Scaffold this active site. Sequence first.
Site, PDB file in Angstrom:
ATOM      1  N   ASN A   1      -7.780   9.287  -5.440  1.00 17.99           N
ATOM      2  CA  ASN A   1      -8.684   8.411  -6.176  1.00 17.99           C
ATOM      3  C   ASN A   1      -9.504   9.171  -7.214  1.00 17.99           C
ATOM      4  O   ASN A   1      -9.672  10.391  -7.147  1.00 17.99           O
ATOM      5  CB  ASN A   1      -9.628   7.699  -5.193  1.00 17.99           C
ATOM      6  CG  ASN A   1      -8.881   6.948  -4.134  1.00 17.99           C
ATOM      7  OD1 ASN A   1      -7.945   6.235  -4.435  1.00 17.99           O
ATOM      8  ND2 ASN A   1      -9.287   7.104  -2.892  1.00 17.99           N
TER       9      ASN A   1
ATOM     10  N   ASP B   1     -12.643   9.378  -7.677  1.00 14.31           N
ATOM     11  CA  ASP B   1     -13.838  10.061  -7.199  1.00 14.31           C
ATOM     12  C   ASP B   1     -13.528  11.318  -6.402  1.00 14.31           C
ATOM     13  O   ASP B   1     -14.468  11.962  -5.905  1.00 14.31           O
ATOM     14  CB  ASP B   1     -14.682   9.101  -6.367  1.00 14.31           C
ATOM     15  CG  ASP B   1     -14.012   8.673  -5.103  1.00 14.31           C
ATOM     16  OD1 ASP B   1     -12.883   9.065  -4.841  1.00 14.31           O
ATOM     17  OD2 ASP B   1     -14.634   7.919  -4.339  1.00 14.31           O
TER      18      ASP B   1
ATOM     19  N   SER C   1     -11.622  11.430  -3.610  1.00 14.39           N
ATOM     20  CA  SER C   1     -11.158  11.085  -2.287  1.00 14.39           C
ATOM     21  C   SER C   1      -9.667  10.808  -2.332  1.00 14.39           C
ATOM     22  O   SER C   1      -9.060  10.729  -3.406  1.00 14.39           O
ATOM     23  CB  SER C   1     -11.918   9.869  -1.749  1.00 14.39           C
ATOM     24  OG  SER C   1     -11.715   8.710  -2.554  1.00 14.39           O
TER      25      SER C   1
ATOM     26  N   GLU D   1       0.818  -1.205   0.000  1.00 14.41           N
ATOM     27  CA  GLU D   1       0.000   0.000   0.000  1.00 14.41           C
ATOM     28  C   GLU D   1       0.855   1.259   0.000  1.00 14.41           C
ATOM     29  O   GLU D   1       0.543   2.228  -0.714  1.00 14.41           O
ATOM     30  CB  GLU D   1      -0.940   0.010   1.209  1.00 14.41           C
ATOM     31  CG  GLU D   1      -2.054  -1.036   1.151  1.00 14.41           C
ATOM     32  CD  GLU D   1      -3.143  -0.682   0.160  1.00 14.41           C
ATOM     33  OE1 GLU D   1      -3.135   0.432  -0.443  1.00 14.41           O
ATOM     34  OE2 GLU D   1      -3.954  -1.561  -0.120  1.00 14.41           O
TER      35      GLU D   1
ATOM     36  N   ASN E   1      -8.891   5.628   3.355  1.00 16.60           N
ATOM     37  CA  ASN E   1      -9.604   6.475   2.393  1.00 16.60           C
ATOM     38  C   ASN E   1     -10.501   7.518   3.065  1.00 16.60           C
ATOM     39  O   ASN E   1     -11.323   7.205   3.934  1.00 16.60           O
ATOM     40  CB  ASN E   1     -10.429   5.551   1.495  1.00 16.60           C
ATOM     41  CG  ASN E   1     -10.961   6.205   0.287  1.00 16.60           C
ATOM     42  OD1 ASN E   1     -11.000   7.394   0.191  1.00 16.60           O
ATOM     43  ND2 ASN E   1     -11.394   5.390  -0.684  1.00 16.60           N
TER      44      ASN E   1
ATOM     45  N   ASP F   1     -15.500  -4.400   9.969  1.00 14.05           N
ATOM     46  CA  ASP F   1     -16.756  -3.907   9.422  1.00 14.05           C
ATOM     47  C   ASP F   1     -17.475  -4.928   8.543  1.00 14.05           C
ATOM     48  O   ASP F   1     -18.499  -4.588   7.931  1.00 14.05           O
ATOM     49  CB  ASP F   1     -16.518  -2.602   8.658  1.00 14.05           C
ATOM     50  CG  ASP F   1     -15.982  -2.805   7.277  1.00 14.05           C
ATOM     51  OD1 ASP F   1     -15.744  -3.946   6.858  1.00 14.05           O
ATOM     52  OD2 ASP F   1     -15.769  -1.772   6.579  1.00 14.05           O
TER      53      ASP F   1
END
Length: 129
Positions: free
Chosen positions: A46, A48, A50, A35, A59, A101
């Site tokens: 990113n 979008d 973000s 990463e 993120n 999550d």
Amino acid sequence: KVFGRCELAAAMKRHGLDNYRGYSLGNWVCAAKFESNFNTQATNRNTDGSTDYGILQINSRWWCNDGRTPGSRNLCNIPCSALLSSDITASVNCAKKIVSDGNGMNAWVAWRNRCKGTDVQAWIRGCRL
Ligand SMILES: [Cl-]
Ligand SMILES: [Cl-]
Ligand SMILES: [Cl-]
Ligand SMILES: [Cl-]
Ligand SMILES: [Cl-]
Ligand code: NA
């Protein structure tokens, strides 16, 4: 800060990631390698709008506030800049929420594509832990 491999392994272990939600330490070291190349200051934008922050590329669309991701959430309740610190505590605590999550470490694309199903124990081989 750019961590060494065993240095990061030991720090992640001290912060409770070894076997957290069943993921052995080598999974976390492998994810961090691919990463961020072990660099706490890594950022990537990113499509979008973000941005991904820190050693685990968390993120801003869901997890932190950077003031420039409209309509996003801040589920770790932190400014994204806190994930760039030389102290990995904020990144680890937020990662614990992410991996809990429902989707496990599949949230990390690099983990899914480069670590999942491999011999991740090699990432902590030789380290004093
Ligand atoms: Cl390495
Ligand atoms: Cl391991
Ligand atoms: Cl925002
Ligand atoms: Cl620390
Ligand atoms: Cl899982
Ligand atoms: Na956000």
